[PDB]
Design a protein around this ligand. Structure first.
Ligand SMILES: NS(=O)(=O)c1cccc(CNc2cc(N3CCC[C@@H](CO)C3)ncn2)c1
Lengths: 243, 195
């Protein structure tokens, strides 16, 4: 059966018909044990000197609010590419950049290279439409856009997850990204200094520092934050038992 | 001339100018990421720019060719305007480095100002089962036909099971040469009087 033809016939996206979206590890308890408490800071990142965010981060999750998401401030790739991300990334560290589905697939790669990362994975958020089997197509678009990409970059020197996330297309005006990206990220056991830029009250999470203009409250303190990684907790993977 | 056509050859050397202009180019390159590999400079030098005036290019990429494919795209005169994702399943509609890979990517680029294409009929996700080696899902031909009905199109690095009506297929695992279009039969004679 041709699922692309079906979509042309019925409006049901081909990914509506993927199913399964043995053996147990559940190591996530290791992660959750070593998790730092959630810290969060309201800040206008356009006007915020990101260098005041210390120490250097092992993982940065960057979710700039793109104009294409809305169809209180949209960020262009011009704004994003000028963030001084490399000034807060650890010499060995990881980035996850939400790029949307348009020009960001190119300009996000430029950003990654600009900040010193090589792209090592391309994670696709595939959006099903089971609940209502076509939006205003971007003028350059050739096809209907039913997915978004999160780019994973690495700078500096086992697999549980796949590079796909499959969830139902959220309500129009809902800009939230699937919480599953946090599960993929934490399953890598990368380092415990994890920063989420442009997070919201609703994304605050144990083990992460969340910075965004729409946070209603802040509890960030640099020395307090630094303390969570002071010896003997320095180079913990975040997937180890407590010392 | 509608029915399938093909040219067993080395794509590095065939003078593709004999073929005329196409509404759609598709290519599954053997990226250097061995067998019948092209190097990045051999890829870069492919004379893609002569195959189209206005139309679309469909370029399969993996690994570091996600970056190199974008480079070739722009070098060849194209802007990437879409990126098709083939989600791979096995029979039971079940999804078959740092992460296991469930998908292959096909960059979509545009050159010129195409007219009379049916944009937005299909979406950018293909769900199909994996088949033989580097055998891309047949759904793609249906997607491209609906997007550009009737027009002439060309596929690079294809195999015998890729020949399709309205397509000229190029590749070195094809069987000989088989051209039906009068114009292209003429030019092929003047350019290669002896095969
Ligand atoms: N003298 S050579 O044997 O042709 C030769 C030897 C070493 C490299 C090359 C590269 N140039 C190609 C490759 C090609 N392939 C690649 C493998 C899959 C096949 C499916 O048909 C399509 N097709 C046309 N040109 C050619």
């Amino acid at each position: 059966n041709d699922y692309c033809q079906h979509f042309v016939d019925t409006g049901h996206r081909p990914q509506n018909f993927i199913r399964d979206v043995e053996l147990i590890r559940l190591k996530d308890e290791l992660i959750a044990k070593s998790n730092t408490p959630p810290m969060y800071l309201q800040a206008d990142i356009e006007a915020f000197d990101i260098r005041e965010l210390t120490p250097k981060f092992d993982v940065i999750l960057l979710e700039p609010p793109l104009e294409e998401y809305y169809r209180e401030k949209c960020w262009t790739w011009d704004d994003i590419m000028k963030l001084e991300i490399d000034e807060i990334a650890a010499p060995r560290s990881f980035i996850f950049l939400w790029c949307g589905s348009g020009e960001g697939l190119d300009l996000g790669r430029v950003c990654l290279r600009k900040w010193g990362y090589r792209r090592c994975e391309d994670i696709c958020w595939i959006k099903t439409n089971k609940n209502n089997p076509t939006k205003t197509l971007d003028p350059k678009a050739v096809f209907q856009r039913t997915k978004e990409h999160c780019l994973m970059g690495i700078k500096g020197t086992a697999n549980v997850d796949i590079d796909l996330i499959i969830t139902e297309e959220p309500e129009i005006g809902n800009i939230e990204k699937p919480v599953e990206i946090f599960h993929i990220i934490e399953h890598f056991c990368l380092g415990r200094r994890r920063l989420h830029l442009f997070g919201r009250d609703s994304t605050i999470r144990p083990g992460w520092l969340t910075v965004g203009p729409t946070l209603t409250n802040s509890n960030y303190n640099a020395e307090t934050y630094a303390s969570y990684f002071s010896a003997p907790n320095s180079y913990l993977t975040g997937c180890t038992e407590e010392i | 001339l509608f029915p399938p056509q093909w040219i067993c050859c080395d794509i590095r050397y065939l003078d593709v100018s004999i073929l005329g202009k196409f509404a759609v180019v598709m290519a599954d390159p053997p990226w250097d990421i061995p067998y019948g590999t092209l190097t990045d400079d051999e890829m870069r030098r492919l004379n893609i720019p002569v195959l189209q005036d206005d139309g679309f290019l469909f370029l399969w990429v993996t690994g570091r060719a996600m970056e190199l494919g974008r480079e070739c795209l722009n070098l060849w005169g194209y802007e990437r305007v879409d990126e098709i994702i083939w989600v791979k399943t096995n029979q039971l509609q079940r999804i078959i480095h740092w992460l296991n890979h469930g998908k292959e990517h096909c960059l979509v680029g545009v050159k010129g100002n195409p007219q009379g294409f049916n944009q937005g009929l299909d979406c950018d996700v293909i769900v199909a089962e994996v088949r033989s080696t580097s055998h891309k899902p047949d759904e793609i031909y249906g997607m491209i036909e609906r997007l550009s009905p009737g027009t002439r199109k060309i596929e690079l690095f294809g195999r015998p099971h890729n020949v399709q009506p309205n397509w000229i297929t190029l590749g070195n695992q094809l069987d000989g040469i088989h051209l039906l279009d009068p114009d292209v039969v003429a030019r092929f004679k003047q350019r290669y009087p002896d095969g």
